Amino acid sequence: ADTIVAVELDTYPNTDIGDPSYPHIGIDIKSVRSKKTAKWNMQNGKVGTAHIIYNSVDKRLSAVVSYPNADSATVSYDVDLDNVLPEWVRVGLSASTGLYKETNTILSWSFTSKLKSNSETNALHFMFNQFSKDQKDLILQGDATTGTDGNLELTRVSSNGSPQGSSVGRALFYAPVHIWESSAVVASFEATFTFLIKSPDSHPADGIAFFISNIDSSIPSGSTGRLLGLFPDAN
Amino acid sequence: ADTIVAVELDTYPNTDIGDPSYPHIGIDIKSVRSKKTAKWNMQNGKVGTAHIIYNSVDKRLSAVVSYPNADSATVSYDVDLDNVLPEWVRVGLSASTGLYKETNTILSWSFTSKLKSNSETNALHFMFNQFSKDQKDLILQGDATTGTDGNLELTRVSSNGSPQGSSVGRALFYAPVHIWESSAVVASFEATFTFLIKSPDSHPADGIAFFISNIDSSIPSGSTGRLLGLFPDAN
Amino acid sequence: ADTIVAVELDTYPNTDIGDPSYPHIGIDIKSVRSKKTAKWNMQNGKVGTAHIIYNSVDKRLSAVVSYPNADSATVSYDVDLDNVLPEWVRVGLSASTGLYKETNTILSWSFTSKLKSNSETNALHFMFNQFSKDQKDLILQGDATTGTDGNLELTRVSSNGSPQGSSVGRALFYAPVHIWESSAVVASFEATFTFLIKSPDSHPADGIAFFISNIDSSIPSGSTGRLLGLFPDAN
Amino acid sequence: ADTIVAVELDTYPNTDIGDPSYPHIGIDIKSVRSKKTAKWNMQNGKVGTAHIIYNSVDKRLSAVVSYPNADSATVSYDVDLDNVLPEWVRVGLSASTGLYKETNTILSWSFTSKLKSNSETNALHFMFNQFSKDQKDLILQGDATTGTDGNLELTRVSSNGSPQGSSVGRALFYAPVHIWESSAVVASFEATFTFLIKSPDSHPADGIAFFISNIDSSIPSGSTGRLLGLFPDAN
Ligand SMILES: [Ca+2]
Ligand SMILES: [Ca+2]
Ligand SMILES: [Ca+2]
Ligand SMILES: [Ca+2]
Ligand SMILES: [Mn+2]
Ligand SMILES: [Mn+2]
Ligand SMILES: [Mn+2]
Ligand SMILES: [Mn+2]
User: Fold this and answer.
1) Which residues in chain C touch residue D175, judged by CB atoms under 8 angstroms apart?
2) What is the CA radius of gyration of chain B?
3) Which DSSP state fits B17?
4) Which 3 state secondary structure label does DSSP give B52?
């Protein structure tokens, strides 16, 4: 199966797989059962921003999520990603719905990785502030589409703009990303994305994640709903 | 056949296909017969740097090449690249040898493209200061290799470091690049590369080019030597 | 007197100093009498974006201005800025009102300059997306203030948000900028700013400019109104 | 007195002020007595590179120093810089000599700071790869000079290139830097510098530091030698 490191914006509390009893941000290392969570005061129908940062010296994966006019939520976990992920990865966004539903709309996405050797810099940077119908530098999986209102819709939305249940979709950047190299003295990455989660319901589900995977990662069988398009089971 | 826009560092004067009688830098629009050239005081065995710049407002493709302690050469050509190239391209480096030969060593390569809409920025940036044996974000073609002394060797070099004749090789960045979009008010790109051209001979050949192509571009049949791995003939 | 190169967003047609009979974008080289203009379909009360680009190889100063959902305006002028400006400059935003008035609100401002030598890069980059009451890396002149609603108000606005007539203000980045150096083979810069020009009147005035000056530039005596805080007279 | 946070490359072991018995890298928070050190296998006459990173989420100041063909040294310290430094700072390089001496030559220096609000980015970036005789965007203090061989010489060097004892010099970037803002959800910075420490002696002294200070910081009285141009005493 795939190797997954993700930051989840988990909109629906599944208390039998260890979610707390509230919407939360979480760090997921090879399991949907977050190694660390924080309470997230999710706002239905508001555009929010998530930031993810890591470096190989500190070996600490950190995330912050906010909305305009509101306090942030943050979570951190000590993990050496060179012990979890392979040397070459792909980076992506995932989202799902289940019997409860929401839009999983991405308005922008940026990513920077840097490898500094002892010679000196290798870097990759992309920024999307709008998505075209045919966005050739993204690999879309499952129900993900680009170009509606210039956005990335990770899960299915109707003609009328209503979100659909039982949906899963992902978008990965086309180029592999180099996160370890034998002469690297510092490796770092940052990601940002802006999202709009809207639901007609009092109980939206299931969430959006930023993830890093093996380069050939695909949507696991039956990873709708609580598994966020990332994991085949709740182990 | 492929669509090619390139900047050539042409080490060998082929006067029957319009080269001037000296090493030169040139702008190549769909032909090895440069639309514009300038004299280049090429230095055998010295590391040099080339810079390429363009934007959609000015519609002028410009290049500068230099060595430390020496004067630069520069060439410019007015061309609307949205009339020559498709909306999605790949970017790359090419080099060849013929019956005359040289190393076509790349020590670093960087590229930045920006699309500014009326909404606002879409960007791609990569930087390579060293190349690994298995450089998964490059597409190598022909004789190109990575990882010898951490460099990109575009054409064949022997165990002893001697350049081989009748060689052609290219490297393209893995992700397609978006150089036109319908809401773009400004599109721009810049490229830089550092190169080491060495020959045991008084007459090195054939040269290195930075190029932009259709995304599915491949080395044309019989494009060794004067055709620089870019063109199928000298039309 | 100061040396000024500017891009003007000129909201009020002063036909006796050569303005065309409509709001316009213009390139100003040492004179309020633009060397080049283009028609600008200015939108009272809409946030717009201006982009300015130049490089020393092409020697062409270009600008684009747009609003969301609208066509752009663009202007270009061939000028070697190394023949007009000194080696060290400051960069800034200016605005004025006269007997006719408008807000001259800046919501964001970014600037990048690069000097590439034959050795290789020297760079400066700043980005402001919000302005604090005490913004220590800006030099405010005249009526300019920071921190109201997190914006830069270049000209006077009342408690109620009404723009005031006979006002002039500028903001310059604190650090001098190096735009020529003797070993530079390419020098370039880009600027972006987002602005909100609002007036209760059918005839707003006078405009906003992005400018480059001698480092010790100050507001000329009596440069309210048609002189945009840039020039002492209409020569 | 000034407020100082620094990363020291300490070439001379002063064991009575807590230095270990070897050249070392250290994190200095308001004291020359490092809060944390690591062994540094300093190489007389070799160009080396230092990297410094921090962010407000992790609150961990980390540094790495290396030379080509050698293993790195690294040091980290948990510190909330918003509790140590004011909201506006200057950033700089310092160096000293005493009765033992060395060159304190800077070949390049780069710095990036980012403030991400809940609205979204404020950024400053500079890069120097060469220094001119009159480098107007640096504040030079004490014996520091620019433009000899295009380098920054932090301490005195003779006509012949011999380093002088009893010397102290600093260079600060001209613009103040904003490292805390009330709406910032993430603040980060990175610095890089390349240095050449050369001595005719078996015992070079005293070292180079990257530092962050109050904006009006100056060289303390009698801060030659072991105090690195940073501190007035060894408290
Ligand atoms: Ca859940
Ligand atoms: Ca030729
Ligand atoms: Ca006017
Ligand atoms: Ca010491
Ligand atoms: Mn969860
Ligand atoms: Mn030619
Ligand atoms: Mn005008
Ligand atoms: Mn020490």
Assistant:
1) 126, 137, 173-175
2) 17
3) G
4) strand
Q: Of D93, D228, D97, nearest to D157 (Cα)? A: D97
Q: Which of D127, D129, D136 sits opposite C88 (nearest CB)?
A: D136
Task: Kindly identify which residue of chain A lies nearest to residue D114, measuring between CA atoms.
Answer: A190
Closest CA to B116 of B186, B54, B58: B186
Q: How far apart are CA D174 and CA D136, in angstroms?
A: 8
* B-proximal residues of A, 215-234, CB under 8 Å: 215
Question: Could D53 and A186 be called an inter-chain contact, meaning their C-beta atoms sit closer than 8 Å?
Answer: yes
- The separation between CA B212 and the C-alpha centre of its own chain, rounded to angstroms, equals 8
3-state secondary structure of B165: coil
CB atoms inside a 10 Å sphere around CB B190: 21
What is the SS3 assignment for C169?
strand
Q: Hey, which chains touch B, using 3+ CB pairs under 8 Å?
A: A, C
Round to whole Å and give the CA distance between C115 and B72.
Answer: 14
Rounded CA separation C225/C202 (Å): 16
Judge contact between B141 and B223, C-beta under 8 A.
no
Distance in angstroms (rounded) separating the CA atoms of residues A30 and A95 = 17
Lookup: tokens for A86: 């392979």
- Of D121, D127, D173, which is closest to C129 when you measure between CB atoms? D121
β-bridge partners, D113: D124, D189
Q: Which residues of A131-152 are buried (b: 16+ CB within 10 A; e: fewer)?
A: bbeebebbbbbbbbbbeeebbb
Structure tokens at B29: 């629009």
Resolution (angstroms) equals 1.6
Name the experimental technique.
X-ray
| C70 and B CB contact within 8 Å | yes
H helices, E strands: number in chain A: 0, 16
Domain that holds residue A190: 1-235
Question: Please, are residues D141 and D91 in contact by the beta-carbon 8 Å criterion?
Answer: no
For B135, nearest residue in chain A (alpha carbons): A178
Cα(D52) to centroid(ligand 4), Å: 20
Residue C61 CA to residue C56 CA, distance in Å, equals 10
CB contact under 8 A, D127 and C123: yes
Q: Around Cβ A98, how many Cβ atoms within 10 Å?
A: 17
Residues of D in contact with A49 (CB under 8 A): 118, 120
Q: Does D149 lie at the interface with C, CB-CB under 8 angstroms?
A: no
Question: In a 3-state reduction of DSSP, which class is residue A180?
Answer: coil
Distance (Å, whole) CA A84 – CA A92: 17
| Contact present, A12 and A205 (Cβ < 8 Å) | yes
Distance CA C173, CA C137 (A): 6
Number of domains forming the structure of chain D: 1
Min distance B184 CA to chain C CA atoms (Å):
10
Find where tokens 């042409």 sit. B10
Strand partners, C186: C116
Q: Which residues pair with D186 in a beta bridge?
A: D116
Q: Which residue of C has its CA nearest to B69?
A: C118
C-beta separation of D100 from D201 below 8 A: yes
- Contacts for B229 with CB less than 8 Å, ≥ 6 apart: B94, B95, B96, B141, B142, B154, B168, B169, B170, B209, B219, B220, B223
CA distance B220 to B6: 15
Q: Do the Cβ atoms of C144 and C154 come closer than 8 Å?
A: yes
The secondary element (H helix, E strand) that includes residue D207 is strand D207-213
Q: What is the rounded end-to-end Cα distance, in angstroms, of chain C? A: 13
Q: How far is C232 from chain D (nearest CA, A)?
A: 27
Under 8 Å between Cβ of A78 and A59:
yes
Q: Which residues of D touch A69 (CB under 8 A)?
A: 118
Give the start-end residues of each E strand in A30-167. Answer: 36-39, 47-55, 60-66, 73-78, 88-96, 105-117, 121-128, 138-142, 145-148, 151-153
Q: Which two tokens stand for residue A145?
A: 């589409």
